[PDB]
Design a protein around this ligand. Sequence first.
Ligand SMILES: CC[C@@H](N)c1nc(N2CCC[C@H]2C)cc2c1CN(c1cccc(-c3nnc4n3[C@@H](C)CC4)n1)C2=O
Ligand SMILES: CC[C@@H](N)c1nc(N2CCC[C@H]2C)cc2c1CN(c1cccc(-c3nnc4n3[C@@H](C)CC4)n1)C2=O
Ligand SMILES: CC[C@@H](N)c1nc(N2CCC[C@H]2C)cc2c1CN(c1cccc(-c3nnc4n3[C@@H](C)CC4)n1)C2=O
Ligand SMILES: [Cl-]
Lengths: 289, 285
Amino acid sequence: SMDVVDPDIFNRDPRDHYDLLQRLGGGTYGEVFKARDKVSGDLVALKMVKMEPSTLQKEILILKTCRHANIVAYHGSYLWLQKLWICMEFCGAGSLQDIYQVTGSLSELQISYVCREVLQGLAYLHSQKKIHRDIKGANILINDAGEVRLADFGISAQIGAELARRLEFIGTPYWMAPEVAAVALKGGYNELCDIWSLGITAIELAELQPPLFDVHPLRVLFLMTKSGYQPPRLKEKGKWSAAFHNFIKVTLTKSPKKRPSATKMLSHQLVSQPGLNRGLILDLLDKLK
Amino acid sequence: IFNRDPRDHYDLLQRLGGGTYGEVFKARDKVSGDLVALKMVKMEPDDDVSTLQKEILILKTCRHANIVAYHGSYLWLQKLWICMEFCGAGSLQDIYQVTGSLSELQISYVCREVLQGLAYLHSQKKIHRDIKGANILINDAGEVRLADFGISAQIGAELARRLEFIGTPYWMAPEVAAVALKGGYNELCDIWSLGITAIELAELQPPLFDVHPLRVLFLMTKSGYQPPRLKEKGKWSAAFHNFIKVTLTKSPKKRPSATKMLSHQLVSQPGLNRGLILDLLDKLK
Ligand SMILES: CC[C@@H](N)c1nc(N2CCC[C@H]2C)cc2c1CN(c1cccc(-c3nnc4n3[C@@H](C)CC4)n1)C2=O
Ligand SMILES: CC[C@@H](N)c1nc(N2CCC[C@H]2C)cc2c1CN(c1cccc(-c3nnc4n3[C@@H](C)CC4)n1)C2=O
Ligand SMILES: CC[C@@H](N)c1nc(N2CCC[C@H]2C)cc2c1CN(c1cccc(-c3nnc4n3[C@@H](C)CC4)n1)C2=O
Ligand SMILES: [Cl-]
């Protein structure tokens, strides 16, 4: 009650409300488990993080204040015995990475529908002055109806925490050049970084991996910052339509001043075409079986 | 670094000031009688001393007439003392607070001397990052000296701390990668800061000084942000107005370098010399 926006954190065992099912996956953030509501029988995903004896509260708040069909729903969190369990919408088919690893390259129409859906979620997030900063196949989830939901605001919360603390150390601003003020306040970039990530994700869904995937991370950073760096392209030309080649070209615009917003990208031919609906992903899921 | 009590070589005379960096004292050499400034920092047991050592290294390796003279440093009982030249008049901010607005010729001389120091630092990709009237000192002989490498010495460590957070970069936008590896800015930020400082020398405060710091930061990050200007138009020459206009170029990509600014009419004019500032020091009495 003392918070402006209540994060809805229960100081109790999540097993009071849920039946813990299988571990779906894990990483540096912690683990994701499947769970079932003890009264309604509805499925949920629990993201469990091991605590040390505030940035997770920021992640919960980013999620809670989203109320959009293309962003995973929030159902409350449990803080118990040094563990935080964030309860969210369960997406029965997993991530697009989980799917394409069995299925192979998605079709152009299936990629188009996913991009339209991700752009809707992004336009909504950017309208709220939020940035995702971790768009990729593993964070775009698919439910049993073939519908698309964005997940994982972990990096978004880490950046929010970093920028809020940074204000404590910057000192007086009056003599700062505008590019120094941009780093101190915003980290030196804006929400258009998500549009680039979606373009890379479209290549990922078409080629099963992002460009340079087998190059070392620090070397990829080095390659991307060289003066003669050029945005990546789809390897096969003839397989894709000129609209998919162009969608990649404009989302992967090098200069952020010319890279279009999520709202603007929703007018692109590739994502505004009439045959885009969840039925395309239902076809993909049939192939999965 | 000397492993001895600086009180053995100096008599502490008067605390000149203090801040987040610690304190600056006026001190006198026990044998020569020459005056020095001692910047002291108390080191806590768990502190990382890397950025303090880098600050000493910058001062020691700078061999330039427009950067404060360095004498040595002392480390004794976890107090670090950086010994530098003592400036009798203090900073340009300490001066204009008593003297008032500097003349266009005095500002032109100061900008020339600051650009010479910045050209030396920028030639080795060293960024001062805290150019302002309080960090430009005037020594007893009338020479203009840049001081305070406290921010500059922390840039590399801050970039390294921030790099740890970077996850996988395969889906990362090139501008995000550039900020992670190159910082989001370069030495041209000092050219902007000198432009603001010239306005401060002329008007007694930087533009928007009465506006809340957070609001100033937000205004600076808007796409329609307009660089500031001198308040009076007729009081200043066309060369001074153009100096302000070009140093305050919003795009760092088009902002002139320190060497390019040294060819500007304002600072390449014939009558600029330390006599213009020794006159300023005479007025101080
Ligand atoms: C990592 C587990 C993932 N492979 C996975 N599999 C699933 N299925 C269902 C059938 C078998 C399997 C393929 C099903 C799911 C997931 C993830 N998830 C989910 C749901 C809401 C939020 C988050 C979330 N919030 N932060 C993070 N996430 C994750 C994206 C990682 C970081 N995740 C699901 O509903
Ligand atoms: C440490 C140096 C500090 N003076 C300093 N300087 C800065 N600048 C910018 C220009 C150069 C310099 C003047 C800028 C910063 C800092 C600290 N900070 C920050 C920001 C978020 C978290 C933490 C943080 N979380 N855990 C820890 N930290 C650190 C405090 C160490 C333990 N820190 C900044 O953004
Ligand atoms: C400390 C107060 C300052 N107003 C001040 N006053 C003075 N006087 C003379 C009599 C009355 C008063 C006007 C005299 C002086 C100063 C500073 N200083 C000096 C000298 C070398 C380095 C640094 C230095 N290195 N890092 C930093 N500094 C400082 C700029 C703070 C950050 N400073 C002087 O010689
Ligand atoms: Cl910063």
